[PDB]
A and B are shown apart, each in its own frame.
With several copies, the nearest count.
Chain A
């Protein structure tokens, strides 16, 4: 129908302009996030190496965070998007976390879930899992202090023995089109960084007390590192999803446009043949 096709061409044209608008704005945010993250990359090297060197050099394993223990029960931290329209980003991290728990844990009680992102909480509310902590509505660019208090809650749950082992599941930014669903172990610190270059350190703070400061500061540092990669990878995923969406829409506009022109030329050859058919008879 000529009237109907014209509506679709007009709708596809308008929605192509919005997909392009979200492609360009995602580019601007990605550029900033790589810059902001690279600003905390030097901070991360400084803190993580000095605290590792004092934790692993000139001393034994005498911290609950350093020492390995047999695992009575465990937790998972999974970090996901608030809004949608980013393609495969949420599914491929949820796919790894869901497959991992069921395959290697055989009791609901065995595992607990910490979640960042509305889509993660939604997936857990559907199906069925419990959630111990479920932070949401973070700003587009994260600050350290947002997860200062939330991390404080998580390290309290670990440090008092509620969970004996804890894993992070998040996306890692590698390339402009390729991003990698990955898992790392936040606690215990069964392994540690080693600069191999150390200097005499003050022996006045109690070693356990001195650690009491540096272990949580390392833990917070690791979690924030995951947010830097997570937010950067979310913005890139929306940008290609928007590039491909716009390219599909513009292709559909040329295909639809030709159907309209073929229909328009047939309607003008029918009306002229009916007119001339009556005129020839009379």
Chain B
């Protein structure tokens, strides 16, 4: 609830603004910033057949997109960034995955922000 309740309504707004922007000639800064997050969300919602994602891993990848850490990564890489984060969570970040399951609740923001920056150092691009 805390992570993603404004996603359904905000994502409809990108659909119209993309349709206008293709025929549009010159856009402004607040329209261009909205166009950059919308593309990542559409690639974060792409899945593959017969591969379900556990709910604790869902809330962690969506926290990255809503809080804006995924803004740095170029688009085609988003799908691989998502497979890698899930592997890393498994190998390294076990404490975050224990808290969400028992309390159905999100951990301390400092510890989560620390962890996502730590993954982003290890990740490489193109």
Contact = CB atoms under 8 A, between A and B. Distances in A.
A29 to B, nearest CB: 10
A244 B24 CA distance: 10
B18 to A, nearest CB: 10
A18 B20 contact: yes
A28 B25 CA distance: 13
Interface string A234-269: 000000100010010000000000000000000000
A166 B21 CA distance: 37
Interface string B20-37: 110111111000000000
A240 B20 contact: no
A21 B27 CA distance: 10
B125 interface: no
B24 to A, nearest CB: 6
A178 interface: yes
Interface of B is mostly: loop
B20 A178 contact: no
A247 B28 CA distance: 24
Contacts of A247: 23
B-side interface size class: under 10
B19 interface: yes
B25 A178 contact: yes
Nearest to A18: B20
A25 B23 contact: no
A207 interface: no
Interface of A is mostly: helix
Contact of A17 (B20, B26, B27, B28): B20
Contact of B24 (A17, A25, A179): A25
Contact of A21 (B20, B25, B26, B28): B20
A73 B18 CA distance: 48
B25 to A, nearest CB: 5
A178 B24 CA distance: 9
A17 B15 CA distance: 12
Interface string A166-193: 0000000000011100000000000000
Nearest to B27: A25
B4 to A, nearest CB: 28
A178 B19 contact: no
Interface string B101-123: 00000000000000000000000
A20 B20 contact: yes
Interface string A15-43: 00110110011001000000000000000
A187 to B, nearest CB: 31
A240 B19 CA distance: 15
A240 B25 contact: yes
Q: Which 3 residue pairs of A and B lie closest in terms of their CB atoms, listed nearest first?
A: A21-B20, A177-B25, A17-B20
16 contacts: A17-B19, A17-B20, A18-B20, A20-B20, A21-B21, A21-B23, A21-B24, A24-B20, A25-B21, A25-B27, A28-B27, A28-B28, A177-B25, A178-B25, A240-B25, A244-B23
Interface of B: 19-21, 23-28
Interface of A: 17-18, 20-21, 24-25, 28, 177-179, 240, 244, 247
Given A21-B23, A247-B23, 7 more contacts: A17-B20, A21-B20, A21-B21, A24-B20, A25-B21, A178-B25, A179-B25
